[PDB]
């Protein structure tokens, strides 16, 4: 037939029209022609290149643009829009033949090609779906809330007869309904036939709950939700909590005896997803060369610190501590017996309104594995490990908590002072031995909790006191204060010049944020940080020894002079650990004397800031050589 004759319809509906064999083979021929000959008048066929790429990477998905099919064969685009199931089946057979022409043995390897329609023009929200959209193609936006596990769904079903024992040839399984068998062809009987899963072929199946994104929801109304079924190649592509656009067939669930609660013949609906599009710390070979180029620069550490938290103004010491915590040191197990922690723990103790929460959020966006937890609030991952039974599923799960989940990563704890006893024991154990022991519900085990910790806390009474020292200013007991490497005390002393630039920064953010209206870019910095944590592992040599013992001996006796809380071995280890993170920002295999001096500066500045006002003025002049 012809395209104009395809536009005219003889059957009652479009589905029965496409169902006719002459019309179906005409559609298949026209779709094969369109797949073969289509070009953008640039001398290149995009679909031939796509077929070659999917053949070379061994993929069962062919991404087909809807605009290309619409401009060339408008009636076929209309047929795909209104009756997508059988149209997609036909064009899947067409694309399978097109791939077969390119690769002859691709059929025995895969035997299935799924066509993913891209750039469907009309976009529906979840609240405006009606029955007119049923059995039609729809493109909707939404945020994924939860996803099930991947299940095997029958694809090529193979049966065996109980009377004879013979295995009867495979049948394709429709995804819409269950298929059954009534004849044996060997016994010529209608006897009981059993499915054997050994010879049956399966495809992946997943269910995803999609809700309307809260920004698009009208004010008084609730966000609507739908169930989206993801097939074999589409499973586990959408992490819960991310916003996607799904194109698929809007259809009805079939359930026994409908719904007895309503009193009306009411059907549940789903979206059978044809395609998923999303609205990664992988570096290429060129990106590694660019990393070496930017790390060769002398002011790489200054530039990294300045790139820390662009929304935060004027807090250079906090940004330096964040840079050390993100880059981290080298954990070392010497001869098996003795273990030394190699990740920096930072505690931001500050008065309210000092933007600690924004810093924690920046670290969460920046770090590879960052887990946010809070002592005061409830809508967060808990810090304590547990074994819990689902009240619906009746199936137990072991959760390690935020500290175990942030293993080889970052744990960001907001409201550090407001914990209960169980959380305090959990973070105490995690900072003590980097593990969490659980003996509950028959499970006795130890989970690895080698997580760097960045915490935010407030002083007692809502304001820091300079005359009192650090231990009196917090409810935190001394052993949990000792485990932190960097202790950033932040107070907003009223200085007119500082308040002027801070207010100017806030107002300029407000003005640029209005709808009617040196730093490394963050995408590059994120991969640079991930590369440094897994590739460098800086080391130090034996001739650098004579200086660190020199300064540390000059440290402790000064702490003897004023009677403050002492410099222990932990301060020396914090010096040697922070220096291994400064050599990671330089991407250097050795730890230099300049990185070591900068680490000494950070540790001494954190020690002096933690003192009372009487001790601080004496300690500042004695260590002015190290602070510079």
């Amino acid at each position: 037939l012809t395209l104009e004759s395809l536009s005219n319809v003889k059957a009652n509906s479009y589905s029965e029209w496409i169902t006719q064999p002459n019309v179906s083979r005409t559609i298949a021929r026209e779709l094969k022609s369109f797949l073969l000959e289509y070009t953008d008048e640039t001398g290149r066929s995009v679909y031939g290149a796509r077929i070659r790429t999917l053949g070379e990477m061994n993929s069962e998905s062919l991404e087909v643009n809807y605009r290309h099919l619409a401009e060339s064969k408008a009636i076929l685009a209309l047929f795909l829009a209104k009756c997508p199931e059988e149209m997609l089946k036909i064009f899947d057979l067409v694309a399978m033949e097109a791939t077969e022409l390119h690769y002859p043995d691709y059929a025995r390897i895969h035997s299935e090609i799924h066509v993913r329609i891209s750039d469907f023009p009309t976009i529906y929200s979840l609240r405006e779906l009606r029955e007119s959209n049923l059995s039609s193609l729809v493109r909707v936006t939404g945020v994924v809330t939860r996803r099930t596990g991947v299940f095997p769904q029958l694809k090529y079903v193979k049966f065996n007869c109980l009377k004879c024992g013979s295995i009867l040839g495979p049948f394709f399984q429709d995804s819409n309904e269950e298929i059954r068998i009534s004849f044996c062809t060997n016994c010529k009987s209608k006897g009981p036939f059993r499915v054997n899963g050994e010879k049956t072929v399966y495809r992946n199946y997943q269910r995803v709950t999609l809700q309307e994104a809260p920004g698009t929801v009208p004010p008084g109304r609730l966000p609507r939700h739908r169930e989206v079924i993801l097939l074999a190649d589409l499973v586990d592509v959408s992490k819960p909590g991310e916003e996607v656009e799904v194109t698929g067939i809007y259809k009805n669930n079939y359930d026994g005896n409908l719904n007895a609660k309503n009193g009306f013949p009411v059907f549940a609906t789903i979206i059978e997803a044809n395609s998923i599009k999303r609205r990664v710390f992988s570096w290429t070979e060129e990106e590694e060369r660019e990393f070496r180029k930017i790390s060769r620069d002398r002011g790489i550490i200054d530039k990294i610190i300045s790139s820390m938290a662009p929304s935060i103004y004027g807090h250079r010491d906090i940004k330096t501590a964040v840079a050390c915590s993100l880059f981290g040191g080298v954990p070392k197990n010497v001869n098996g017996k003795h273990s030394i922690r190699g990740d920096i723990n930072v505690l931001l103790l500050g008065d309210p309104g000092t933007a600690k929460s924004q810093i924690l959020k920046y670290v969460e966006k920046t770090a590879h594995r960052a887990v946010f937890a809070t002592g005061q609030g409830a809508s967060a991952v808990g810090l304590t490990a547990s074994v819990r039974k689902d009240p619906i599923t009746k199936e137990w799960t072991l959760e390690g908590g935020a500290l175990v989940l942030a293993d080889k990563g970052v744990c960001l704890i907001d409201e550090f002072d407001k914990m209960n006893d169980q959380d305090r024991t959990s973070i105490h154990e995690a900072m003590e031995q980097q593990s969490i022991s659980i003996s509950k519900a028959g499970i006795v085990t130890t989970l690895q909790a080698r997580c760097s910790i960045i915490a935010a806390a407030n002083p007692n009474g809502g304001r820091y006191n300079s005359t009192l020292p650090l231990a009196q200013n917090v409810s935190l007991t001394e052993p949990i204060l000792s485990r932190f490497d960097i202790l950033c005390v932040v107070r907003d002393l009223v200085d007119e010049e500082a308040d002027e630039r801070l207010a100017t920064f806030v107002v300029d953010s407000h003005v640029r944020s209005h709808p009617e209206n040196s730093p490394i870019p963050q995408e590059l910095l994120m991969k640079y940080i991930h590369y440094a944590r897994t590739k460098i592992y800086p080391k130090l040599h034996q001739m650098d020894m004579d200086k660190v013992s020199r300064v540390y001996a000059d440290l402790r006796r000064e702490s003897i002079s004023t009677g403050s809380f002492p410099i222990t071995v932990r301060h020396l280890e914090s010096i040697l650990r922070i220096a291994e993170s400064f050599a990671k920002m330089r991407l250097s295999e050795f730890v230099s004397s300049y990185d070591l001096d900068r680490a000494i500066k950070v540790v001494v500045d954190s020690f002096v800031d933690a003192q009372k006002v009487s001790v601080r003025r004496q300690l500042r002049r004695s260590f002015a050589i190290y602070t510079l």
Partner: protein, 49 residues
């Protein structure tokens, strides 16, 4: 202060332990130099060898 005055628990708990050690902060230069050298030996890798 007394050893029982320093601990934040009952003095009768001390009697239940067979050996009690009181670890001291020496605050000496030559001991601090040696312990710093030892820790740098551990961190460098000379201690492993």
């Amino acid at each position: 202060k007394s050893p029982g005055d320093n601990i934040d628990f009952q003095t009768t708990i001390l009697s239940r332990f067979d050996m009690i050690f009181i670890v001291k902060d020496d605050h000496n230069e030559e001991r601090d130099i040696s312990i710093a050298n030892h820790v740098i030996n551990i961190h460098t890798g000379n201690a492993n060898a």
